[PDB]
Design a protein around this ligand. Structure first.
Ligand SMILES: O=C(Nc1ccc(Nc2ccc(Cl)nn2)cc1)c1cccc(C(F)(F)F)c1
Ligand SMILES: Nc1ncnc2c1ncn2[C@@H]1O[C@H](COP(=O)(O)O)[C@@H](O)[C@H]1O
Length: 595
């Protein structure tokens, strides 16, 4: 079995070599299967494909679509149309993207067979890693994994995030014993409907088995950071449970009590140890004191999660940060072939079996923007670029055809070719296009921010005052982070504006933001209350003065809706007068509002 572990790792690696070497043959083979299997579906037939399966006809005939283009089809399916609308296979469920249309979560169709390709990509992760850090099979992994809120569409189909349906699927719930997926969190502890009990029991099991832990993490840095904050707010009770060997009576779930009972045993010496480390004024490096055998931290810190690297580096004492894979609700994408690289060097290799990948060349106005446009010498020729044909150093937007009824759908991700593994390109992740604010899974764009602020400023009309200018940033100085707005008012009124109405503005912004933002505030507690900081009169003029000094024409300058440049955020913060916070949670409820 030690041997058949090595054999298995050698095979998964040889698969990487074969699929990256044969990537176009695979991409052609995948497409040919999707259009063969789905030739009589309504969507393809309606576009005149006539059951043709060749890449050349497919690119020439099918339109490149956004989610809003195909919403009719998706909504009919989510209303119970069980005909072969987009897929020849029944849509098993809908996977709810964190990206939104109309403030509501986008509904990505999937089919049951897609669970295999997802496990396939997961199955690549430890074989790759074991190359660089051997011996992880002799240990456990402390990962805080969580199910999230879940819904039913009008037609009856489930609607839930990928990981929720993955964690509940047979592929995970009854998974075969893998010594590389030997976690300190028991299943029933992850599958717990109650998120507090789920976090409480996972932390207890992590501390209980603290010396077996060779890696820690969560899916996102934000989530793992919230678990450290939890240990900070709950270590006396947890130590007490370890000491007495009994689980807090507040843990109701009998699944969990049973599960925790297998691990938890009275350990006064371990309680003393937890306490002595948590009691220290500094938590710098506490991860490697509590879990001293930890070899790395397994959290995504690419994309907007990059803001969390310093807080991570503080708690881990500069342990390596490891970003293993890249994926979405519509499709699992690729693998990091160099897991021990610096976060700003991470490249993802798309596995050509997951879907048929296409690439639309894009051009950004700077390296800092999440805003797109189309090159001059490049939306009439939607004869895009194929996987093997992307060029080193160029940026593209990601396009995907999936087994489950997406044809040439724009994911909305911007990638940059950083290199190649054999013939398969490796992408550095740039951004999800138009996102300007993000703490956890929430992804707010400028349009949403703008319309939220337009709603908010109506509370000022009674007082004969207005918003001259504003900007925002994502404040991660606290756990959880929050959105900050900088407001400069114009006051032409003789009733002073009571503080309650600035709070009314914070709430009104929050209520206008999408349902992922609101679910974060209401359910996930992944986002703290919005803040509005009022700045001295003249502040945005002083900004514009910088811009002009540096080359800008006045009749063209526009105050950015969002800023992430630390020195400019620091300047704005220097001219703050007061700050106001949302006084309660916005409204959120599971599902689309129509339901
Ligand atoms: O899934 C992701 N990371 C992940 C990695 C390992 C494990 N651990 C497992 C898995 C399977 C089994 Cl069988 N055992 N252990 C769990 C989750 C991921 C990554 C990037 C984006 C997204 C998405 F949400 F945006 F799609 C998801
Ligand atoms: N490893 C990663 N690094 C940066 N961003 C990621 C990564 N994985 C997923 N994402 C982002 O999250 C999206 C998927 O969101 P969702 O559909 O909500 O699961 C992707 O399309 C990317 O925008």
């Amino acid at each position: 079995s030690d041997e058949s572990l090595a054999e298995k790792n050698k095979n998964k690696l040889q698969f990487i070599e074969d699929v990256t070497t044969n990537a176009d043959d695979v991409q052609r083979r995948v497409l040919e299967e999707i259009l063969s299997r789905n030739a009589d579906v309504e969507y393809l037939k309606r576009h005149g494909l006539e059951g043709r399966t060749d890449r050349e006809t497919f690119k020439h005939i099918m339109p490149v679509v956004t989610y809003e283009d195909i919403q009719p089809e998706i909504n009919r399916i989510a209303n119970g149309d069980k005909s072969q609308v987009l897929c020849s296979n029944p849509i098993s469920e809908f996977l709810t993207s964190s990206g939104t249309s109309g403030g509501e979560r986008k509904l990505m169709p999937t089919i049951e067979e897609e669970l295999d390709r997802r496990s396939l990509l997961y199955s690549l992760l430890m074989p790759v890693m074991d190359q660089f850090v051997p011996g992880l099979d002799k240990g456990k992994g402390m990962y805080f994994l969580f199910i999230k809120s879940e819904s039913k569409t009008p037609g009856g189909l489930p609607a839930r995030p990928v990981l929720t349906s993955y964690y509940k699927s047979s592929h995970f719930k009854n998974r075969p014993y893998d010594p590389y997926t030997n976690y300190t969190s028991p299943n029933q502890t992850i599958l717990c409907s109650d998120s507090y009990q789920s976090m409480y029991s996972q932390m207890l099991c992590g501390l209980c088995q603290h010396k077996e832990v060779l890696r820690v993490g969560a899916v996102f840095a934000s989530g793992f950071i919230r678990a450290i904050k939890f240990l900070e707010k709950h270590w006396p009770e947890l130590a007490r449970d370890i000491r007495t060997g009994t689980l807090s009576s507040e843990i109701t779930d009998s699944s969990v009590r049973e599960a925790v009972g297998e691990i938890l045993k009275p350990d006064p010496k371990l309680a003393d140890f937890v306490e002595s480390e948590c009691r220290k004024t500094s938590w710098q490096g506490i991860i490697t004191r509590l879990w001293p055998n930890t070899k790395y931290v397994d959290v995504i810190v690419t994309g907007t999660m990059s803001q969390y690297i310093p807080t991570l580096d503080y708690y881990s004492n500069g342990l390596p940060l490891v970003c293993t894979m890249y994926a979405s609700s519509e499709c699992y994408f690729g693998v990091n072939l160099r897991p021990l690289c610096k976060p700003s060097e991470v490249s993802y290799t798309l596995i050509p079996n997951m879907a048929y990948f296409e690439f639309l060349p894009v051009h950004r106005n700077s390296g800092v923007t999440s805003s797109i446009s189309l090159p001059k010498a490049l939306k009439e020729q939607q004869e895009l670029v194929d996987l093997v044909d992307v060029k080193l150093g160029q940026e593209y937007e990601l396009v995907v055809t999936t087994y489950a009824g997406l044809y040439r759908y724009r994911v909305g991700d911007v990638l940059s070719v950083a290199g190649f593994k054999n013939n398969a390109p490796q992408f550095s992740f740039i951004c999800r296009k138009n996102v300007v604010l993000s703490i956890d899974s929430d992804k707010t764009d400028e349009v949403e921010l703008q319309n939220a602020v337009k709603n908010a400023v109506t509370h000022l009309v009674p007082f004969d005052a207005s918003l001259s200018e504003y900007t925002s940033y994502a404040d991660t100085s606290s756990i959880p982070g929050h959105y900050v707005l900088f407001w400069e008012l114009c006051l032409n009124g003789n009733t002073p504006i009571p503080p309650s109405v600035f709070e009314d503005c914070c709430l009104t912004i929050e209520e206008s933001l999408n349902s992922v933002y609101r679910q974060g505030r209401v359910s996930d507690k992944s986002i703290g209350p919005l803040e509005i900081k009022m700045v001295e009169s003249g502040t945005f003029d002083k900004l514009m003065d910088y811009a002009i000094s540096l080359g800008a024409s006045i009749n063209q300058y526009k105050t950015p809706r969002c800023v992430k440049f630390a020195p400019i955020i620091e300047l704005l913060n220097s001219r703050v007068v007061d700050s106001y916070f949302s006084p309660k949670c916005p409204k959120w409820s599971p599902g689309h509002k129509q339901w």
